Amino acid sequence: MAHFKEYQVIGRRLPTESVPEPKLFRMRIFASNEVIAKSRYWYFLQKLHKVKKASGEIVSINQINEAHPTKVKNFGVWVRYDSRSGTHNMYKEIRDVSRVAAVETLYQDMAARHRARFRSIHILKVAEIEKTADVKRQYVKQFLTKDLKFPLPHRVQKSTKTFSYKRPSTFY
Amino acid sequence: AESHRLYVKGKHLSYQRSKRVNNPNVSLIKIEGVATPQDAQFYLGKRIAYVYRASKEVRGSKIRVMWGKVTRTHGNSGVVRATFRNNLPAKTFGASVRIFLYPSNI
Amino acid sequence: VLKKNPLKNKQVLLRLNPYAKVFAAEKLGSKKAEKTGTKPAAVFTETLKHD
Amino acid sequence: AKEIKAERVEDQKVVDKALIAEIKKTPLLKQYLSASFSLKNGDKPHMLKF
Amino acid sequence: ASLPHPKIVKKHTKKFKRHHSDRYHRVAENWRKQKGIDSVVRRRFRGNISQPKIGYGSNKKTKFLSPSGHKTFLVANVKDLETLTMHTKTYAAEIAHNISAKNRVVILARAKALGIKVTNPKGRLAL
Amino acid sequence: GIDHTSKQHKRSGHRTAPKSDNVYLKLLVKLYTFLARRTDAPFNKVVLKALFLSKINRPPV
Amino acid sequence: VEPVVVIDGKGHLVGRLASVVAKQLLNGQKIVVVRAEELNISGEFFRNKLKYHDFLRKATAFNKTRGPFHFRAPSRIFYKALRGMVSHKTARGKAALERLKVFEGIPPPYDKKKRVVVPQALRVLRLKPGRKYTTLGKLSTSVGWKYEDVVAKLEAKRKVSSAEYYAKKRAFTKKVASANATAAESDVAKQLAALGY
RNA sequence: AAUUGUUGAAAGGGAAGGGCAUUUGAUCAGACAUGGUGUUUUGUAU
RNA sequence: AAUACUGCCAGCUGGGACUGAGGACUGCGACGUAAGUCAAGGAUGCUGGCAUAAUGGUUAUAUGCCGCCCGUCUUGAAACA
RNA sequence: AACUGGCGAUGCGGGAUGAACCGAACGUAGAGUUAAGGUGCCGGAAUACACGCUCAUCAGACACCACAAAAGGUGUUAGUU
RNA sequence: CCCUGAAAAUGGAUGGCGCUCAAGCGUGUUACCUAUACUCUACCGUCAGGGUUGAUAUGAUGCCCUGACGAGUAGGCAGGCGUGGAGGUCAGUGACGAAGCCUAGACCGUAAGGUCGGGUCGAACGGCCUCUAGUGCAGAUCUUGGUGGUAGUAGCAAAUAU
RNA sequence: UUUGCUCCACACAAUAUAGAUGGAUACGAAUAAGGCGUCCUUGUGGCGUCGCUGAACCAUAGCAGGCUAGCAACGGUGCACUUGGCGGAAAGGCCUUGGGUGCUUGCUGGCGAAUUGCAAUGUCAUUUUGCGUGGGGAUAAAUCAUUUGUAUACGACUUAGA
């Protein structure tokens, strides 16, 4: 499900004759489509409030596009995750163009670093880091220097045939 | 000219098979120079002759032939499926078949 | 004897659906909607965009 | 166990009289028709425009 | 010539030989159903012989039909040959195996006059 | 394979023909099968279905 | 495209070369492997020497002369990689093993013929720079190959015998790359460039 | 019939035998070569 | 304003594969003022070769893949039952 | 022992292999599409793409299942104060 | 994640080869492979629903249409094939060759089996309808008879010796 | 051994092909580096250029490729002669001097092709033998039987004998 989109899902309780007009809870949900987005919304709303899907009602679901989805921005993501020996909170910075692409990068990375699937990850917050000199991870801080300049040494080239004839080079 | 080839060479790889079951009714042909199914779509419907040699003559020729045609692609690497009038003998797993340019669409 | 598919085989599609000739002539599957300039409210827009 | 018609030869001639008079008006096309097509080594008919 | 018939499909041209018929000489060529509790033939394992099922039954229009397109009728004399005079386009006469050589020529001459196709005209030819 | 809600290839459990080799009874079946098919009255259906009946199902009257 | 290509074994990972080699034999292509003593295996030299000693321990208990034959030549180590990758117990795989020759160095008549490489089986284009790799000549000498020195001697003779060939090949290439430019800037040259040659 | 001898055919790298499919070799039936869009019987049924 | 994505078309069109079952008509429909025609309750038209071992069959062999030795007792058999 | 599903009685695709597991239940053929499982080669199918982790002088590689624990490591990678 | 912990006896097991920005691990997007599964079509059978007689189809448990199904041990039922004999019938076949037997020779039947051709043979035997039974064999450490591999093998070596 | 055997050449027949259908088209080394060209007060040098796939390069037009008249030349490419080498890793091939001869599409011509009838690989290759033409070359061993015992169950080994 890492062709993610970001949705806002708004929901509330069922309106009763004693208490109509409920509190209209809204949250941002990263999911591949609206069915998972409404499922993850009722998941976290059961983690917060005494309401379920039968006792509640989806009032709105809207796909959130970024206002500037083509601007490189640092994303400080607060995330909890369930491990094999407990639960931990952690906080990772992801430098991406999109809030959705940062969540895609974190889901790939958390599965790579801690074997944490989509099942055992709850994204607490995705905050855009507004400035620099406030990121506190060196793997993001190294890309925020003046006049960034690095090569990609040792290029492998894709071969369209089994046999080559030139003893291929690796320069780039 | 020293080249009189109107066909393109292809290799009869194997039968259309599972891991432990093969189906000799339709065969797999790897056409030379073809690497994608998008470029293998040109070759569907084209005639395939397996041209081989027997020892005695039948109709004034020691050359005999099995006729077939490409039915569909098979995989992501330009291997195509071929259905023959009489199936390939399974001793030709790696022999050269001839994919002619007829029936053409140019 | 033999089942013929509609949505191909237009004679079978015209044996059924007497409106299919009118649908094909008037292009009712590709009809242009009316142009309007309704703007969404600011309260919906800032709720969608905040945080 | 096991002859070209004189009418076949003469209508072939009067077709050829009209056809040659425009073949020669463009360069090298007469040499192209007298040659024969063949697939070489390395050329692929799925990408060779004819 | 016969009346036109559908294209004949035998649907299993191979003989249904018995299991282990070539392994043991006491096991005959004719088909017996394997009724053992552990037989791979009865259990229909992959790679074993096929048993006669009703799926292999031939078409009704092409049943009992020779490759010449005829139903064979085993005749024995001229009186049996009169029953195929008006049915020449379906039934081909077949001379019985116990008919003498002097009695085969009179039926062959009668069937050639009546236009009845004989499937075995070369039987017991004196030369 | 399908979920077999009932028994497939189950016979109807009723007689479609008399078990007898009585030629005169089969003539009466032949006449009343024609009458049951070609008349809308259900009398010919009941008489035909009772003509099928066995000796223990045709008691003396 | 070719009745027989000759594959250089220099700078090749053994299993990555042998797999695309084994597919080529079973697709009816004759191929010859030369310089199998310069084949590479990923991993440390002690890792692969201990790996071969684990294989060398496997022999039939009651009679060692009918057991697994632990061949110590780099050509036959590579041949052991092909077996298993080919269905060698059937007649198709026996024919596939018939169409394949694996050699130490470059023997004649393959010295004077074009050696090809497999670029997606090369050690350079497949291993991350910094990994440890084992050349097959050093590994085979440690496990019992007796001919590292003579293959190195014959390759030293073949390298200078081919260097003088390339010296006159540069001389002819210099002459033909001067002659085509001398024949350039003409009507036939600019027209052939217009069509695309 | 088991089993054996001779001849002929075929195959054979720790079995053979079998099924699906085809090659190759050997061997085997069918059309239509139908009274058939008729065509003067050499003192009128090819 | 485009474009991406999702969706719709009783949109057009190209290439391939396999199938041709039924055997007078009926029925539904379409186009045509009618007459009739038709992609409309299942394939016809044209052309070529051979007319026999050509195709097909049998049989043997080879090859690719599969295939444990049957009967029985058994929860379980290829069993070192 | 309880509910249920299977094997017995059941072949087929997969799990290399197996009565039970996964898929799926079986007339005979053809065509297409998938399931479970896979796509380096054996072996049909991408040595595809993307993000990372690991270098093991007994690595690891798919559930049933054919094994591994406590503990420890400025080995390395993330993270919490 | 990797390492130490982590030691079993034939040689050895991610299935094998091998694999190190993997062909390992975690994850994700697709593309592709193919089961007797699903769809469509044909054919077979079964089951169900039907249709078919004011002169017309060999006269109806027939023919035809429509639809759904089709695994199977123990078991049950049904439709058939075959053998010995009997009552009819074919004014059946046969010394111009019956029955038998052989036939990598054909044809029909899903099959049980039937039919034909060739060879041998020498005296009786079939088709159909029906009746009857000492009626179908691969097994029973089955019975009787015969023949093999073993195998030209073991053995024919006590009693002094020719 | 019905004048045996082998090798050059040719016709003819088989059986036999793990699979010709333009071309194996040759540096080595490194990849966090190289190749090529040029220059120098010759290096682990300077400068320029290239790669980012062989989708390249060579070859490639002609009754499956005929006949033939020329045009500017001195090339190209077979087939043989011949000057000499090189190559022992399985060398058995590569390179070169010169002559002869066929073709030449580098350019301009002329004739021919059909009826294989709308396609049927529409046959041209690569191995080995077996009968004959017409030239060359050579003119024996082994086994058994006898014998030895450096050997030995028997074979084998090891001897000897015109």
DSSP string, G48-114: HHHHHHHHHT---SS-GGGS-----SHHHHHHHHHBTTB-TTSHHHHHHHHTEEE-SS--TTSTTSP
Q: The tokens 């030629």 sit on which residue?
A: F23
Which residues in chain B are contacts of D42 at CB distance < 8 A?
A: 33
Which residues in chain B are contacts of D34 at CB distance < 8 A?
A: none
Q: How many whole angstroms separate alpha carbon G6 and alpha carbon G32?
A: 5
**Boundaries of domain holding E66:** 6-127
Q: What is the dihedral of CA D34, D40, D44, D50, to 10 degrees?
A: -10
CATH number of the G148-197 domain: 1.20.5.4280
Best residue in G4, G23, G26 for a mutation probing chain B (most B CBs within 10 Å): G26
Q: How many whole angstroms separate alpha carbon G53 and alpha carbon G45?
A: 12
Q: For residue F61, how many other CB atoms are within 10 A of its CB?
A: 3
What's chain A look like in SS3? CCCCEEEEEEEEECCCCCCCCCCCEEEEEEECCHHHHHHHHHHHHHHHCCCCCCCEEEEEEEEECCCCCCCCEEEEEEEEEEECCEEEEEEEEEEECCHHHHHHHHHHHHHHHCCCCCCCEEEEEEEEECCCCCCCCHHHHCCCCCCCCCCCCCCCCCCCCCCECCCCCCCC
Q: Which nucleotide is nearest to E121 (CA to C1')?
A: K117
Whether any strand I atom is under 7 angstroms from the Cβ of E48: the reply reads: yes
What is the distance, to the nearest Å, from the Cα of residue A113 to the centroid of all Cα atoms in its chain? 15
Query: Closest residue to I77 by CA to C1' distance?
Result: E38
Is there a domain that residue E31 lies in? yes
Q: Do chains A and G touch (3 or more CB pairs under 8 A)?
A: yes
Phi then psi dihedrals of residue B79, to 5 deg: -70, 135
Compute the nearest-CA separation of B101 from chain D (Å): 8
| Residue B94 in contact with partner chain G when CB distance is under 8 A | yes
Q: The tokens 């070209």 sit on which residue?
A: D4
Fold of B1-106: Thrombin, subunit H (2.40.10)
CB within 7 A of strand L (chain D, 3-42): 3-5, 8-9, 12, 31, 34-36, 38-42
Q: What angle do CA A30, A34, A35 make, to 5 degrees?
A: 105
Contact A8 C49 (CB under 8 A): no
Whether any strand I atom is under 7 angstroms from the Cβ of E46: the reply reads: yes
User: Which DSSP symbol is given to E83?
Assistant: G
Which residues in chain G are contacts of A165 at CB distance < 8 A?
A: 114, 116-117
Q: How many whole angstroms separate alpha carbon A166 and alpha carbon F29?
A: 94
Q: For residue C7, how many other CB atoms are within 10 A of its CB?
A: 9
Domains of chain B, by residue range, sit at: 1-106
Strand J: positions under 7 A of a protein C-beta atom: 9-15, 17, 24-33, 40-53, 55-57, 77-81
Q: Which residues share a beta bridge with A11? A: A25, A58
Q: For residue A47, how many other CB atoms are within 10 A of its CB?
A: 8
Cis peptide before G109 (omega within 30 of 0): yes
Q: How do strand A56-64 and strand A86-96 relate by DSSP bridges?
A: unpaired
Domains of chain G, by residue range, sit at: 1-147, 148-197
Distance from residue B15's CA to nucleotide L161's C1', rounded to whole Å: 70
Query: Closest residue to L22 by CA to C1' distance?
Result: B3
Is there a domain that residue E117 lies in? yes
Q: How many whole angstroms separate alpha carbon G8 and alpha carbon G10?
A: 6
Q: CA of A158: which chain G residue's CA is closest? A: G120
| Residue G3 in contact with partner chain B when CB distance is under 8 A | no
Which residues in chain B are contacts of G20 at CB distance < 8 A?
A: none
Which residues in chain D are contacts of B4 at CB distance < 8 A?
A: 36, 38
Q: What is the dihedral of CA A95, A98, A104, A109, to 10 degrees?
A: 0
Homologous superfamily assigned to G1-147: Ribosomal protein L13 (3.90.1180.10)
Phi-psi region of G84 (alpha: psi -120 to 50; beta: other; left: phi over 0): left
